[PDB]
Amino acid sequence: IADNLTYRKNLREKDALEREIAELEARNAQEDYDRLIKEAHYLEAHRSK
Amino acid sequence: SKQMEEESAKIKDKYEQANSFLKIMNDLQTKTEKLEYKKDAIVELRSRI
Amino acid sequence: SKQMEEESAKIKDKYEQANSFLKIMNDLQTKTEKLEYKKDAIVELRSRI
DSSP states (O other), rough: OOHHHHHHHHHHHHHHHHHHHHHHHHOOOOHHHHHHHHHHHHHHHHHOO | HHHHHHHHHHHHHHHHHHHHHHHHHHHHHHHHHHHHHHHHHHHHHHHHE | OOOHHHHHHHHHHHHHHHHHHHHHHHHHHHHHHHHHHHHHHHHHHHOOO
8 A cells, every 4th residue: 555655646746747748848949949049140140240 | 330239239139048948958858868767667666566 | 261271170179079078978967867866766676675
């Protein structure tokens, strides 16, 4: 029964992790930052010239 | 010269945004490894309990 | 211009070494948190059996 309580708490911990991973994957910041850094680099070149 | 400082300031703001996105995705990959090892541990937890 | 060529090569090399050790230290932090959760797992293992 101690093990079963551990199982229960692990269940909700895993559920919380599965929610958080889905949310931060839906954020999709990688492509956005790739676009942002491309714009940054081109603007840096413009400021350099 | 005025053009120079305005260019530098706006590119610095762009830098701040890029660094924020970069640290966000770094935390995202950290959470990815978190999910990995957590599900690995959960497998053994379910194996025993 | 030729001077800039060779020093551009040199700074490129500097960037290569910087990134090579930056990824190494990032993996070091990864292994640090890895050891942390592995110690937690070993704690649970000694508790269980």
